[PDB]
Design a protein around this ligand. Structure first.
Ligand code: NA
Length: 274
């Protein structure tokens, strides 16, 4: 991904595009919409976007092309090339038409996009604002921010268990947090980029406590499991058989009983467990 090319696509078209969801979408007829513009810029920047996705499907294409989420409806440390998807529904599945927007950070402060902020004035589709001001003005109910993993050619859409081999199937808890009514683990080895508690958090109640050398120890209460403690996996852990790409890695979708789905960067349940 050539970030200079991505941002120059927008900067070079200030004064030269008109906003429309009904024309070429990508500026080839002098008109573009938000998602056609970013898709075209991303292609020109060397990202293999197929067609001209909407805001409903762009995230999935970014995940398959080495990007990961740095924010889901949170504050974050902005950097040039971050791609912001936003909705006026609960997530991007509800972002069709005027319900969705997308643009790109030029730097830690300024956001550029093809938008309706100039009410469709001729030539005036490409607009730049400080993100903090754009957000308070436009008030989307959901935002997600995508960032390219520069390691994506090297990790090559492999499971992190293959990228970073370890002989022992046990893991460290980097963070332990009460989320959605249960104590859960953030394990950086299993979720190496773009961790999200909802997508990647591991229920403490479904792990086996082990010492720093992987030796089985007695399982304490879940509210007593701490960051820097270790764990392994010994029947209510289900491999759904569904895989996906994200941030240049393979992830596998598990289900932890009624606690729901957990995506982890290993090939399958046999790679995960002891
Ligand atoms: Na144990």
């Amino acid at each position: 991904m050539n970030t200079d090319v991505l941002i120059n696509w927008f900067e070079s078209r200030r004064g030269k595009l008109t906003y429309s969801m009904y024309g070429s979408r990508n500026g080839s007829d002098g008109t573009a919409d938000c998602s056609g513009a970013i898709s075209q810029a991303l292609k020109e920047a060397g990202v293999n976007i197929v067609g001209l996705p909407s805001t409903v499907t762009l995230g999935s294409q970014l995940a398959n092309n080495g990007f990961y989420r740095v924010s889901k409806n949170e504050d974050w440390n902005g950097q040039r090339g971050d791609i912001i998807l936003m909705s006026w529904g609960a997530d991007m599945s509800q972002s069709g038409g005027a319900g969705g927007h997308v643009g790109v950070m030029m730097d830690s402060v300024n956001f550029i996009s093809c938008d309706y902020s100039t009410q469709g004035a001729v030539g005036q589709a490409i607009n730049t604002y400080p993100w903090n001001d754009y957000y308070v003005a436009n008030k989307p109910s959901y935002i997600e921010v995508w960032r390219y993993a520069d390691t994506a050619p090297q990790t090559n859409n492999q499971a992190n268990t293959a990228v970073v081999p370890q002989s022992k199937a046990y893991y460290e808890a980097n963070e332990v947090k009460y989320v959605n009514g249960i104590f859960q683990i953030k394990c950086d080895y299993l979720a190496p980029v773009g961790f999200d508690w909802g997508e990647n958090g591991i229920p403490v109640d479904m792990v086996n406590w082990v010492d720093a050398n992987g030796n089985d120890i007695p399982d304490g209460k879940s509210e007593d499991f701490k960051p820097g403690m270790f764990f392994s996996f010994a029947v209510n852990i289900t491999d759904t058989g569904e895989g996906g790409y994200y941030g240049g890695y393979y992830y596998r979708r598990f289900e932890f009983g009624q606690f729901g789905t957990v995506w982890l960067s290993c090939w399958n349940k046999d790679d995960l467990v002891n």
